[PDB]
Amino acid sequence: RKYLFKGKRLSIFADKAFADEPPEPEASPSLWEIEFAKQLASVADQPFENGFEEMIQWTKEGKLWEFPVNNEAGLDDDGSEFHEHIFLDKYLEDFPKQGPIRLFMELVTCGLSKNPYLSVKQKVEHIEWFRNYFNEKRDILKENNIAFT
Amino acid sequence: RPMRRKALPPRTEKMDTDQDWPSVYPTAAPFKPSAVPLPVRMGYPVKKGVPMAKEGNLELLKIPNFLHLTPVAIKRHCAALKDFCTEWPAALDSDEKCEEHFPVEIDTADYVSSGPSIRNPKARAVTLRVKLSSLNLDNHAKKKLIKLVGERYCKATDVLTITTDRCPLKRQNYDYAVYLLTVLYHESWKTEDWENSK
Amino acid sequence: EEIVIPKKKTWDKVAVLQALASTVNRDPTAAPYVFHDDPYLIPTSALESRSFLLAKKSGETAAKFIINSYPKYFQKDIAEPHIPCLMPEYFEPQIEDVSEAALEERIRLRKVRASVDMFDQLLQAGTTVSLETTNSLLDLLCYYGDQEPPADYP
Amino acid sequence: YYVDWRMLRDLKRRKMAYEYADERLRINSLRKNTILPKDLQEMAGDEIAALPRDSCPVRIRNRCVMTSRPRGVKRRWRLSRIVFRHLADHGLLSGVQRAIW
Amino acid sequence: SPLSEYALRMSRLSARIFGEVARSTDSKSMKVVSLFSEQPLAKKKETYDWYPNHNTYFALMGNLRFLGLYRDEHQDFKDEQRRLKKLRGKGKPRKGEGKRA
Amino acid sequence: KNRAARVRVAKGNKPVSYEEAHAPHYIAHRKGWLSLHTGNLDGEDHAAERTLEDVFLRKFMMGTFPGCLADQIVLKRRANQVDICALVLRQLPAHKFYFLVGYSETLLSHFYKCPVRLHLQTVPSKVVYKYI
Amino acid sequence: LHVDVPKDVTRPTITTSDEPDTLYKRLSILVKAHDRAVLDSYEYFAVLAAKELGISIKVHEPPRKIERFTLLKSVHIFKKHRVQYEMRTLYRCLELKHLTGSTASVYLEYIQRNLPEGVAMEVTKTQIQQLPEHIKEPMW
Ligand SMILES: [Mg+2]
């Protein structure tokens, strides 16, 4: 008799041959859409039932460590590569191609390649400091027969 | 006039002997004398005295109890965790069989400690171990490979050990050790004119 | 000859805890987990149930007040990885200059009266305001109906 | 408030040495070698001297974090022998016991 | 024994591969590699964070005591000794009005 | 004579608890450790930081529950979680404990940036091991 | 629960990828603690858990380490009178074998999450992989 899905319908609308044609984020989430979502969450918001459900919520919030333990979780050094940390001679092009300054900077870049506590950006900054230092000391170097830049 | 609240009787009294104990202690919790239906006693006893009772027992509270981990729970836990596991290939039934198809061994270490920081400096280090027999090396190549690596090569086991910890992260140190192997292998095959003067 | 390596299964960070939770059931002899597990602290009646969960929330709000009012004492971060939800919150605008950008901050922070003052000031100067930015102001005002967002404080 | 004025002075020495660590590293590197002209090395010998004295990291002293005691400190806990004994003898240090053998 | 040409040229080929110092460097000049390969003492977390922030603890607990959420038995002890001392007329003099003019 | 952590004999009228009765040389023999972390194990770091955090957490709980603590608190660190287990006298009303638990947990989680939980076992009165 | 039981409990979603899985020849778990009995219970829990998931496990006890240091007993002078303290570290090594990467993550998570207080783990995974494709063929 009172069949839920058998009988006449309004028929104002038609079958959705095309579905969800406009994207859900038509614009950046507005205050109206941001607030309705918060209310939907409260609809199913019930208190913790055991220590598992509490730890699940802490994990979703980042409060509790993820397992298995990864000692480098969230620790990506600018998405670098091993070759960037190890091969640093590209940055010594401005320096003299030979001579005492080249011999010294070779030692500097050798240590920087073996430094696990510095990022590529910090390693480059050590190189740049010496470039500007010797430039300021152009006159003292020239007396010693060393030509810089 | 002031009313002091009365504590309810411990809920252990309402616990049946055929209860579902895993449900009582789902996760690691401190010992609660009102939830553990056992007449447990702990404490060195005074002369003509018995060990102290569970109620108000600091010593039982100081113990890392395993009530949450019981043989009945562990079996019910691992039953759910079976869907996660994947099957080891049957063909690799021996250690020698593994060396045949997968000669390269990469060692990586994790560390678990208690504190706010999950950081350990030792987690970056990586160690690669390969046998020279597994590598396709001519008589010339093997001699050159063994001189370049120095003490990394072990004659007794014929295993080359490359340990890389210079880079900050573990993914960089791992990629570096694989790189070191390629250069050492390819360089060993290359023959230089100065080598004829040995 | 070639060995067949199994295809690795993957799961969410909470998948393992969710699996362990499925095994356990409700303890029939215990009060809800929210309530403290002690005979003295178990809610006897329905009033003490609600009153105990209103004193707990009251202490949580008392702690957040201290943290959000003296933030300099809760700023040292010693947690690796960094936990954003355990840091002090700041809700007052820190952009002093009167620009369309400053108005956008107030709109983001949801201050209604302050944003109206800076929007009118922008009109007084006559500086251009984007239609999108003007709509973000109306959204805040229309949704809150010209009234400051409800909050509780001393 | 820190324990005393001596702990405060040390705290500032530790915060100014952190600021000048890179600088004193780069300049001091120019002197700890035999590859650069002695004229440059003599000049870097003066730039390092010109930096503030509290930048020098050898003026830091390890003091008990709770009592500011200069000597008798244990570096693993940063506590003096006297303060460490109070915590150990009470069971408040995890795993520390008396040594009987 | 001495290193023949084959021995020396192999060592340079190895150092070139393993990113070690390739030239002949004196012990003095090897400190530059050490300085730039090791974190300086002042940059290590133990040095710059040797102390707890004593200002944060003293200020925070003082603020909590005034909000009524923390009780300092020590401070209440001192607060009453000052009250009693002031009644006895031994209280702190005002600045600039000390016994000596 | 050794005076360290010894509750000296009176005339039979001083009620000492199990923890108080035992001198330091019984640590690891008859009585355990009040704090359990991994920072004093061999080849482990951050002993200084765990020990300082404990000292504060003990002074904080005393002031937050003044006169309501029957014995010393027990601190348990697992992963980044901190757990405070305290025997508390039944002096205060029940709802007051719910406030102090919510307050002390939230405040200590935002101060050390770790999840902190408070576990309270209420006793009718202090438990006396022996009268000394 | 006597009469009230869940009907269709929700279970996490485990989707098999198309990437090949890691192959761990060995996986050494060195747990450390001040208390031997805690290691015995964890050894029982871990060995029982390994056996229930099909993992092959072996256990041995590395020699214990005791670190002793001396301090001065008096606050002032009285040099000759000292007090000595010690810390004891005890070890239990769980040597697992022939594990895929999915089996080693779920097992390590399960046993790492249940690591008692005062116990520190030191996992040492040993992966096995083929040779780099460049190394396979010598190229000049
Ligand atoms: Mg000194």
Curated annotation (Swiss-Prot), chain A:
It is found in: Mitochondrion. It comes from the Eukaryota. Coiled coil: none annotated. Belongs to the mitochondrion-specific ribosomal protein mS31 family. Component of the mitochondrial ribosome small subunit (28S) which comprises a 12S rRNA and about 30 distinct proteins. This is Small ribosomal subunit protein mS31. It comes from Mus musculus. The lineage of its organism: Eukaryota, Metazoa, Chordata, Craniata, Vertebrata.
UniProtKB/Swiss-Prot annotation, chain B:
It comes from the Eukaryota. GO terms for cellular component: mitochondrial inner membrane; mitochondrial small ribosomal subunit; mitochondrion. The keyword Repeat does not apply. The keyword Transit peptide applies. One of its GO terms (biological process) is mitochondrial translation. Its main location: mitochondrion. Keywords: Mitochondrion, Ribonucleoprotein, Ribosomal protein, Transit peptide. It is found in: Mitochondrion. Belongs to the mitochondrion-specific ribosomal protein mS35 family. This is Small ribosomal subunit protein mS35. The gene is Mrps35. The chain holds residues 43 to 240 of 320 of the full protein.
From Swiss-Prot, chain C:
One of its GO terms (molecular function) is rRNA binding. Signal peptide: none annotated. GO terms for cellular component: cytosol; mitochondrial inner membrane; mitochondrial small ribosomal subunit; mitochondrion; nucleoplasm; plasma membrane. The keyword Acetylation applies. GO terms for biological process: mitochondrial translation; regulation of translation. It is found in: Mitochondrion. The modification N6-acetyllysine is found at K72. Keywords: Acetylation, Mitochondrion, Repeat, Ribonucleoprotein, Ribosomal protein, RNA-binding, rRNA-binding, Transit peptide, Translation regulation. Its main location: mitochondrion. PPR repeats lie at residues 95-129, 130-154. Mitochondrial RNA-binding protein that has a role in mitochondrial translation. Belongs to the mitochondrion-specific ribosomal protein mS39 family. Component of the mitochondrial ribosome small subunit (28S) which comprises a 12S rRNA and about 30 distinct proteins. Associated with the 12S mitochondrial rRNA (12S mt-rRNA). This is Small ribosomal subunit protein mS39. It comes from Mus musculus.
Swiss-Prot record, chain F:
It is found in: Mitochondrion. Its main location: mitochondrion. One of its GO terms (cellular component) is mitochondrion. Keywords: Mitochondrion, Ribonucleoprotein, Ribosomal protein, Transit peptide. GO terms for molecular function: structural constituent of ribosome. GO terms for biological process: mitochondrial translation. Belongs to the universal ribosomal protein uS3 family. Component of the mitochondrial ribosome small subunit (28S) which comprises a 12S rRNA and about 30 distinct proteins. This is Small ribosomal subunit protein uS3m. It comes from Mus musculus. The chain holds residues 36 to 167 of 167 of the full protein.
